Structure formats: C-alpha cells, structure tokens
C-alpha cells in the first residue's frame, strides 16, 4: 500500500496495458505483477471495468492538456489544438482509444463541454453548428486512432500481402505511407474539417 | 446442414449478435441457438474470430452497395454516397463497427481501393490527396458509428445525469439531439470534410 498507492496501481496497470493490450489486461495479471493476492487488490479495485475507467482518466490528465481556449485563441486554432491534444492522449498507451471508449464522463468534463460551447457561440456559431463541429472533430480523431492502433495489435499473427503483388497505385501508396506514417493524414483531414466549417460559419445569413 | 448451411449459420450469428452484442457472442451460444453440438459447429467455424470475419463481410455485402463511382458521378457525390453506404453497413447490426474493426480486407476490396484511386486521380487529385481524402472520410465515418453504438450498449447499467441538473447550454443541446438524433450531425460533418477538400483541390498550383 506503498506497492498499492493509487498512483502505483495506475502505473502498473498502464505498463501491463502496454505489455498485453486491452484484451489481455485482467485484474489477475495485475495482482501478479504487483505481487499481491487477488483479494488484496480487489479491496482497491473492484473489476476490469473500474480499472479501465481510471486508466482512461489518467491518460487524459497527463496528455489532454489543451481542453480549453487560450486567452484570445481563434476557434480554428482551438479546434486544431484540442484535436491534437485529445489525440496525444489516446496514443499514449497501447489500445488507448478502446480504453477511452465507453468510460463515463466526469463532472469537470461536462463543465468543460459547457465552456467549449460558450466560447464557440461567442465566436458566432449557432449552438447547432458548435455541437456539429466538436462532434465531427471528435469522431474523426477517435476514428483515426482506433485504426492506427488496430494495426500493430493485428501485426502479430496476420500479415499484409507482400508489397510487390500490388496493383501499381496501391504500390505507390505503400511507399508514401512508409515515408510519412499517419500523422500527416490526420493533420490534413483535421485541417480540411476546420476549413469546411469555416465555409459553414461564413454562410451565416445565406447560401453556399 | 440445412440448419448448418453457410447462409443459415451467418443469419443465426447476426441474430445472436443483436441479442448479446459482440461481448456476449461465443461459438458456444451459437451452438445452442442452432441446436447442435459444439464439435459439429466447430467443423464449419473454427472460432470467434473466423465467425466475426464472416459477419463483417456479410454486413458489407448486404449494405455497402455504393463502393464504386457511378457513370459520370462527381467525386464529391461519390465520397458522400460511399460514406453513407459504408455507414449503413456498420449500423445494420448491434456493434457493427466493432465487428468491422480488425477483419482482413478481401482481394476484391483491394481491387476496389485501386479503382477508387484511379477515379479520384483522374479527377485531378494528386495520389497523396486522394489517399488523405478516403482516409479522412473513413475515419470520420467509423468514429461516428462506434460512438453512436457505444451508447445503447452503455444504456443498460449506467445512466446520464437527469436532463435538469445541466448547465443551460448543455440543456439546449439535449433538446436538440433529442429531436434530430445523430444522422444530421454525421451528414453535416461529411459535408464539411468534402467542402474542405474542395478548397484543397482548388489549391492545385498555389496558396490557401
């Protein structure tokens, strides 16, 4: 209970998560890793679900640090930096995005939602459009990360066809994604969404 | 083996999937539902993983019917209709999107990828931008559906705070999403992405 300080159980869980993925993670494997009996760990942590909720929240604490607008930030810059920040959280551990999936939102998060809307609307968005914008940026980001993370968890047993059986376009696509990874695609898409809203908001009174 | 025709095992699995979700789905529960011994079912279906691959593909066969460009369709219309179609597939069964997650792509799908690129590039996209566009529309769509589907699988035990403890913006947001559901947000975001690429492609030789 130094061994079982909340912050040490959290760190152990994170390291386990990286070792075995969300699949493998069990309260049992945590008990062995910490070197304690299962009922001792059960006093602190009821089940796999309660443990994930804590992992989800921790990841967001450490890394999702741009969750509100900086003093006189434009809404475009805010949306962009908030999406990047949320993404750094999801990526910070193996299966980050699945861990995040289905965990309840905390009270401070609701409050943050509220401010995020106050801000956007004070920049001239209708409430409808503010919600559509935060929603789209979030889906896009979440979707980016599940795919990227599904890769190296499917990397183990399955494999791709060899690079040289491919039709020639697909073959240049491999070269290209080899060189850049996935960050540039994410950034490009983020930037297209934000541009598309910009054309949206410039609509204001009429047709586009 | 009328009871165990491939198409009857598939339909049974789909119905089971709706009853218990991806979590609950086991080859064992399938054996009981079909009324056969587990080793008889095991002759046809090796494991949970092989079964999901078949469910993923079936869903896409039945519903993802707009996977290539219609005779003289514009690329905007194509992107839009393809995203909608992929989405109808994911939504067609409980946990559709998770089922889809990690399943290998079939040979015809690679071939379809290739045509989709041939088309976009023949409409004046660079190969880089064609890939960024298909990628963003896909992430966004996948992300939309996991969230929408996570809801009614978390609906069971957990509940939201009551509508009347909310700050007033959040409270109008509830009204609004009550009335429209989630389709309109998806359509709006799809349409913003596509607009954002449009500003992209109009760049062509210069700065935007």
């Amino acid at each position: 209970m130094s061994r079982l300080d909340k912050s040490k159980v959290i760190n152990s869980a994170l390291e386990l998560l990286n070792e075995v993925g969300i699949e493998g993670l069990t309260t049992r494997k945590l008990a062995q890793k910490l070197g304690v009996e299962q009922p001792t760990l059960y006093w602190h942590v009821k089940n796999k679900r309660a443990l994930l909720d804590a992992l989800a929240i921790e990841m967001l604490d450490r890394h999702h640090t741009h969750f509100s607008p900086l003093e006189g930030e434009s809404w475009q810059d805010f949306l962009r930096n908030n999406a990047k920040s949320f993404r750094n959280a999801l990526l910070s551990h193996r299966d980050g995005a699945k861990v995040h999936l289905g965990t309840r939102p905390t009270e401070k998060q609701y409050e943050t939602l509220e401010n995020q809307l106050a801000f956007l609307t004070q920049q001239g968005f209708s409430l409808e459009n503010a919600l559509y914008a935060l929603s789209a940026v979030g889906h896009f980001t979440l979707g980016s990360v599940l795919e990227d993370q599904e890769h190296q968890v499917a990397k183990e047993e399955r494999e791709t066809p060899t690079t040289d059986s491919m039709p020639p376009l697909l073959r240049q696509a491999i070269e290209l994604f080899d060189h850049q990874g996935a960050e540039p695609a994410f950034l490009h898409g983020l930037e297209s969404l934000i541009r598309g809203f910009e054309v949206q908001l410039t609509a204001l009174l009429q047709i586009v | 083996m009328s009871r165990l025709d491939k198409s009857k095992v598939i339909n049974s699995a789909l119905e089971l999937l709706n009853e218990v979700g991806i979590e609950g789905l086991t080859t064992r529960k399938l054996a009981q539902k079909l009324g056969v011994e587990q080793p008889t079912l095991y002759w046809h279906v090796k494991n949970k993983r092989a079964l999901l691959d078949a469910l993923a593909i079936e869903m896409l066969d039945r519903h993802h019917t707009h996977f290539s460009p219609l005779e003289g369709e514009s690329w905007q219309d194509f992107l839009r209709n393809n995203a909608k179609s992929f989405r109808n597939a994911l939504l067609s069964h409980r946990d559709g999107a998770k089922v889809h997650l990690g399943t290998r792509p079939t040979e015809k799908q690679y071939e379809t990828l290739e045509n989709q690129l041939a088309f976009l590039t023949q409409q004046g996209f660079s190969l880089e931008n064609a890939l960024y566009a298909l990628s963003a529309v896909g992430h966004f769509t996948l992300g939309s559906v996991l969230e929408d589907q996570e809801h009614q699988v978390a609906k069971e035990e957990r509940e939201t705070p009551t509508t009347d403890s909310m700050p007033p913006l959040l409270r109008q947001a509830i009204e609004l999403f009550d009335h429209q559901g989630a389709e309109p947000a998806f359509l709006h975001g799809l349409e913003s992405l596509i607009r954002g690429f449009e500003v992209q492609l109009t760049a062509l030789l210069q700065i935007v």
């Binding site: 499917a154 791709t160 690079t163 491999i174 | 992929f86 889809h100 990828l113 990628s135 769509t141």
Partner: peptide
C-alpha cells in the same frame, strides 16, 4: 508500416 495503412483503407470498400 505503409502496408498497414493501405490495409486499413482497403477494409472500407
């Protein structure tokens, strides 16, 4: 690396 991205994209067809 590249092989997996195209795998992702092909999956959605």
């Amino acid at each position: 690396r590249g092989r997996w991205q195209v795998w992702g994209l092909a999956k959605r067809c």
